[PDB]
Paper text:
The [name] system comprises two genes, [name] that encodes a protein with an ATPase domain, and rdrB, encoding a predicted adenosine deaminase domain protein. Here, we determine cryo-EM structures of the [name] defense complex, revealing [name] as a heptameric, two-layered AAA+ ATPase and RdrB as a dodecameric, hollow complex with twelve surface-exposed deaminase active sites. [name] and RdrB join to form a giant assembly up to 10 MDa, with [name] docked as a funnel over the RdrB active site. Our results define ATP mononucleotide deamination as a determinant of [name] immunity and reveal supramolecular assembly of a nucleotide-modifying machine as a mechanism of anti-phage defense.
To define the role of [name] in phage defense, we used cryo-EM to determine a 2.5 Å structure of E. coli [name]. The cryo-EM structure of [name] reveals a heptameric assembly with two layers of interlocking protein domains. The top layer of the [name] assembly contains seven N-terminal AAA+ ATPase domains with an active site formed between each pair of neighboring subunits. Extending from the N-terminal AAA+ domain, the [name] C terminus is a largely α-helical lobe that interlocks around the assembly to form a flared bottom layer of the heptameric complex. In contrast to most closed-ring AAA+ proteins that form hexameric assemblies, [name] is an atypical complex with 7 repeating subunits. [name] also lacks a pre-sensor 1 beta-hairpin insertion common in many clades of AAA+ proteins, and instead contains two large insertions not associated with designated AAA+ clades. The first [name] insertion occurs after strands β2 and β3 where a canonical single helix α2 is replaced with a four-helix bundle that forms a crown at the top of the heptameric complex (discussed further in Figure 4). The second [name] insertion occurs after the sensor 1 motif and includes three helices between strands β4 and β5 that reach into the central channel of the heptamer. In contrast to the N-terminal AAA+ domain, the α-helical [name] C terminus contains no detectable homology with other known structures. [name] is an active ATPase in vitro that preferentially hydrolyzes ATP.
Numbering used by the authors:
A (entry chain G): 35 to 50, 69 to 76, 81 to 94, 102 to 140, 147 to 183, 190 to 395, 412 to 519, 524 to 661, ...
B (entry chain A): 35 to 50, 69 to 76, 81 to 94, 102 to 140, 147 to 183, 190 to 395, 412 to 474
C (entry chain F): 475 to 519, 524 to 661, 704 to 897, 910 to 934
The structure:
């Protein structure tokens, strides 16, 4: 290094305190300096205070090393020697002073025989150093002390020896370590001087405060004394030795990934990390991958070495799942960090039940609860920042090649954090706050979910015990349907009945049914439970019979309690059996990231509240038939909640899915479909004909959206009766919205003769339009003009 | 195992820190490796830190085992010997350093007679290892340390000896255990360095917080140092050695239920558990029985061994109530767990009055209160 | 702590040196992360409880881990919006809470706020200040902080034009956030921001601010902000729109003076506490803030304007930060909005003579006379904020006599 040239060269003209300190490799740099010195300066062999005999003063080790150097010189090529012996023996017999339990008078006679008076070990050692300098043909002898991170008690002996014995011209001291450690040592030793019973007696806040300021002053002066500021050495870090974002990179160093790597194929060093991160996190080349790489370059240099070496050696292994490799390397390297945070230790239950609970725990200690599920490395501390990248690798590996597990991550993990913020934080002390979390976990089943629909059923209760402002049954992503026909209706408004709905429309509709058993056993039609249903029929199996009971689990009336803090489906099954196979072949080619999954949720969750407000205040008596943009009903709200999902997946997946290098969505102003399908009709489309000029399909690129848009479960909600706008203007999108959907799915969704009834019935919802919503007074009519 | 081939074979081309760590049977795998090594590498007999004399440094045991190996070789088929003795005696007389209550000046004269200067035990032991390697016709001597689950204090002496003495080419170290235990040991030792009255004085939340982050950094660096990540060994678990749901099952092993079992009628291993579970829980072949079996396959391998053996031996007994047999085996095997949870200890009041109260207690600590009476194995914890 | 103060002052001086984005960062995240806590979060808070309230205030504010300046300003809207009282108007510290539901019986032409009727840069400038807070009603705030946060986010993107494009889309897009846990059509505007960003890029490097300057710019700005939050609060009449006069105020006049409060605060302190010039060009005078008129702003620019010439200096070499801020296309639509311009015989003599001084600094002439004439009885000028109703605003009495 040029910095080691620094240290040598300033030491060289520093003799023509005298202690040089190096922050922080420390050991490698210290050894480099020792060498560069071999204009003469002697250098003692580097002393490691953590490896010395325990009860052995540093003066003993320094004197022994000096004795060996002096005697090795004295040997080659007697008058000088016995007068080196003289000082060695007298320093020895003067060395009881450092070790004794007490003074005994026999030591007075030792102090009266004869340049200052007495047996002061400082003087004797300084003459010993004068001896050594005369003998060795050197002026100054470099006593160099090695880092003490292992056991920093020995640092105190080092500091005291530097202060009392190595203070002399013939000695130049190079110490290294971390100045917080020496701060700690000195502060503790300064507190040691205060008398006992004084400390137990004066315990007012003022006394502790002034003694703190005071140990301040003493420790600070001690450190400015032993380690002069002008003599302190950089020892930069890695990120400083490489480029920041391409605008830097002084003295790049390169790492070697493969055995052959003939000193030319070395793929950089920033690269090796970027490539591990992008492969094992599934992150694309966006600013987020350079993000993770920047944080990981700031690591202790050994940690980066070990993680980057384990990853690539086991990768050579694999080629005679990259996220599995990166996850293993991160688990081992950041093992103490994750074991701190209380995350799952075991490998034998990595799975994803423990993954969601790990994310919840991380978010709990990272606080946040809003962007925490992103798992970005932004935290206060090194420990949680390491845990963030480790959990990102966990997500990338576990969710890879599975549409069910993707929806799982999305719902259980991220929702388990979002739902808690907006609907459970209004209650919560720290003892009380964690216990509220403890039940929120226990009730939510976070860490031990049976099924995604079970979580969504419990999510309905949590969401449904807080909202206000006229007490409508239009909650975040759901509608609370009336189940008692005791209310005087205008027009054709009436109950909800599952029997009037048929085939797939019934099956799609019944999946979203949710019953909560607080006291009234209501029924919610919720988008989450529909998403939970999709997750549950995404990884059942190749069977048709297994899909059958998979339906019966989500189809059946699912009933659950509020938390402790408030034949006829024959063709639809073949179709789900259809789409499941479609998912099965081609879900394996999906590598999502905590970024994509978190951002898909962010759009989806945001789009959800715009629907919960714009369509809230549009429930008129004649708002049914939903023919227009300013008329809304229970069918339009749900359709746009489903469309909010699909749009959220389409957008972020066009942005943050590592299956394609680039976006097909374009540089545009990006909105969500709330009251119309302007934005959705759009992005599909602009992507639609770009795919052709790029010679790509919805398969190879945008897999997750393709599988979701092709789900028979979703289709009835897409174009429900009374959820389709019927304006001359509005139709030009919606008819042209239909074509694009058919072209992606591969089968044409509704017949014209089914399309005509919509805009002027199996696989289409026809009974939700006129289903009354709680709190919706339905007494007013739509505005004119 | 192919994994033991792993450990041997990477050790083989690891000499052409240097410490290999194995998670976790640990003892059986360690012994297998010691053997597979017998291209020469010497291997010391496996050291169990929990069975050594108490106050005895690991260096003493390592040096004694090396002395026996070297002298057993030196005996068959003198110039070399007294110069092995030389280093043994000088290492000895340099061994007061590890044990002394304090330093006494008489030890200075011991440090001034004569390649670095002094009586540093590291150097003397490294020359002792050079001695042994020259004598034994080997390059590196495998110091292999056994698991410490019984009493993990001795792990600290092991770690310090690895750091200060076994750091040398002529030595390759294979340690095993659970890295949480060593994390604990190192963190406690790091907290030991903070001065007393400092700890009793600075007790703001910020001070504890930063000292926690700090003992973090130190403990983590210590472990990345002594146990390099690239050198850490799998030691999978049972469920990984068998099928998940029929879509896996690499190197199935089989268990034997009956005395005769002529190595062909042995009814699998996943089966034996599935059949105990289905008989003693009355569960049918639904996903719930495969459930219970999956959880029980993830157990410490000894626990599964003992429960599965008690059940079937007492079953042979019964045929010259299966749920009674499985219940007895589970009570004995999971005895510490149930005694933790406060459930009924006694057998003489199993009955069902205590059963309902046991379920209520379990549900209380499992929280839940909604699916808890299902008694499915879904909880936070192993217990 | 006295030593820590000088150390942190050095940190501020080094980090904010040669960067207009980082200057706005310091100003907003650091200083605002303190004032906002005082006036809107201290009313809740024991020491154990007090620190934990701080801990979330940090965590929610993103202090120490902000992504973007606009993100902080979005979160600042929620914090400011869960305390005020006294007739419950949507005229908060530096913001206006606009009605988003057209369910209220209006006098005159009062109606909603719509982003679609605003065009080009006026839309882009207007949409940057949009802020949605998702407690239970998902309101929409037009806030000066988010506009300042927007400027910070398009000050250090890069030389690209495409990077500016998505930089817009991040701040332009509806930004929605939660209350704390304690309660094609923009084509030419982009070239212009691309314009002004280059202008910033060449000459922001010559800006060395201090914790004193940044703190004092905030002090004036923060103070000027509450005078606007009170003087213009009690002037929302039914015919107060068109803002033709000094005692008539609307949603456009409040915002214009909030923007003018910023620019005046920067101009004054930077004439006093910027180490690029040895001396002040502002003069030894009695120093006020433009609250209900531009007497004071028209003034100081000007007295500095012709001193610069006798001193042979320009707005470039001296007063860089104000020059870059006043030349920002994002700010210009708020400077002379429809219904925010006083139209009295007396009041115009400043405002017409206020316009000239601005053009002469920026280097391009801001509004055509034929755009100026319509103002004093449309792209790059806000024309829809005047008649946008404010929550709580009575809007029943029109300029109550005496």
């Amino acid at each position: 290094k040029s910095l080691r040239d620094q240290l040598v060269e300033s030491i060289r003209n520093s003799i023509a305190r005298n202690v040089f300190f190096v922050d922080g490799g420390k050991t490698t740099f210290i050894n480099s300096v020792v060498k560069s010195l071999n204009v003469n300066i002697k250098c003692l062999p580097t002393i490691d205070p953590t490896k010395l005999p325990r009860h052995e003063p540093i003066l003993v080790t320094v004197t022994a090393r000096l004795n060996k150097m002096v005697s090795d010189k004295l040997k080659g090529y007697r008058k000088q020697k016995e007068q080196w012996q003289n000082h060695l023996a007298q320093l020895q017999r003067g060395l009881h002073l450092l070790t004794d339990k007490e003074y005994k008078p026999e030591y007075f006679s030792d102090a009266l025989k004869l340049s200052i008076g007495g047996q002061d070990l400082s003087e004797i050692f300084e003459e010993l150093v004068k001896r050594a300098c005369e003998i060795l043909d050197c002026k100054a002898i470099l006593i160099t002390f090695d880092d003490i991170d292992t056991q920093f008690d020995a640092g105190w002996d080092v500091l005291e020896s530097i202060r009392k014995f190595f203070n002399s011209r013939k000695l130049v001291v190079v110490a290294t370590g971390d100045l917080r450690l020496y701060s700690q040592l000195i502060r503790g030793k300064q507190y040691e001087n205060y008398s006992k019973t004084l400390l137990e007696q004066e315990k007012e806040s003022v006394r502790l405060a002034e003694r703190g300021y005071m140990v301040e002053h003493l420790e600070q002066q001690y450190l400015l004394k032993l380690f002069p500021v002008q003599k302190r050495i950089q020892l930069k870090t890695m990120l400083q030795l490489v480029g920041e974002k391409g605008k830097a990179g002084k003295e790049e160093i390169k790492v070697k990934t493969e055995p052959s790597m003939q000193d030319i194929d070395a793929i950089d060093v920033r690269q090796a990390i970027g490539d591990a991160v992008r492969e094992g996190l599934n992150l694309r080349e966006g600013s987020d991958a350079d993000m993770y790489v920047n944080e990981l370059l700031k690591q202790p240099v050994r940690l980066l070495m070990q993680v980057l070496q384990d990853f690539y050696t086991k990768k050579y292994h694999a080629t005679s799942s990259v996220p599995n490799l990166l996850r293993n390397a991160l688990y081992g390297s950041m093992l103490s960090n994750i074991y701190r945070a209380g995350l799952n230790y075991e490998q034998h239950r990595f799975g994803m039940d423990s993954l969601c609970k790990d994310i919840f725990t991380y978010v709990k200690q990272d606080r946040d609860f809003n962007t925490g599920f992103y798992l970005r490395p932004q935290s206060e501390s090194e420990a949680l920042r390491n845990c963030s990248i480790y959990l990102a690798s966990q997500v990338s590996e576990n969710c890879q090649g599975s549409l069910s597990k993707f929806l799982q991550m999305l719902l259980v993990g991220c929702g388990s954090v979002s739902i808690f913020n907006q609907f459970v934080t209004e209650l919560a002390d720290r003892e009380k706050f964690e216990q509220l979390i403890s039940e929120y976990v226990a009730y939510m089943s976070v860490g031990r979910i049976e099924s995604a629909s079970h979580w969504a059923n419990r999510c309905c209760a949590v969401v449904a015990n807080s909202p206000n402002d006229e007490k409508i049954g239009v909650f975040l992503g759901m509608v609370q349907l009336n189940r008692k026909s005791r209310q005087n209706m205008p027009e054709g408004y009436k109950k909800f009945n599952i029997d009037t709905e048929n085939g797939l429309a019934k099956a799609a509709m019944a999946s979203s049914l949710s019953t909560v058993a607080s006291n009234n056993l209501m029924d919610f039609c919720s988008v989450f439970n529909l998403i939970g249903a999709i997750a549950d029929i995404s990884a059942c199996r190749c069977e048709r019979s297994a899909i059958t009971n998979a339906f019966n689990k989500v189809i059946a009336q699912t009933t659950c309690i509020v938390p402790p803090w408030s034949t006829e489906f024959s063709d639809a099954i073949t179709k789900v059996e259809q789409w499941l196979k479609n998912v099965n072949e081609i879900e394996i080619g999906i590598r999502p990231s905590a970024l994509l999954i978190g951002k898909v949720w962010s759009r989806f969750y945001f789009n959800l509240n715009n629907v919960a407000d714009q369509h809230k205040t549009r429930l008129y008596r004649n708002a049914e038939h939903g023919r227009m943009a300013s008329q809304s009903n229970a069918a339009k709200i749900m359709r746009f909640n489903v469309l909010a999902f699909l749009h959220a997946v389409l957008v972020e997946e066009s942005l943050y899915h590592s299956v394609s290098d680039r976006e097909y969505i374009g540089e545009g102003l990006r909105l969500n479909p709330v009251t119309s399908v302007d934005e959705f009709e759009k992005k599909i489309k602009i992507i639609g004909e770009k795919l052709k000029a790029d010679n790509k399909t919805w398969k190879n690129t945008h897999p997750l959206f393709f599988l979701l848009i092709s789900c028979p479960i979703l289709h009835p909600f897409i174009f429900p009766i009374g959820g389709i706008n019927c304006s001359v203007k509005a139709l030009n999108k919606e008819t042209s919205f239909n074509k694009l959907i058919d072209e992606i799915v591969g089968d044409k969704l509704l017949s014209d003769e089914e399309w005509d009834y919509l805009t002027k019935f199996q696989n289409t919802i026809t009974s939700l339009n006129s289903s009354t919503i709680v709190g919706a007074s339905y007494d007013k009519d739509t505005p004119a003009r």
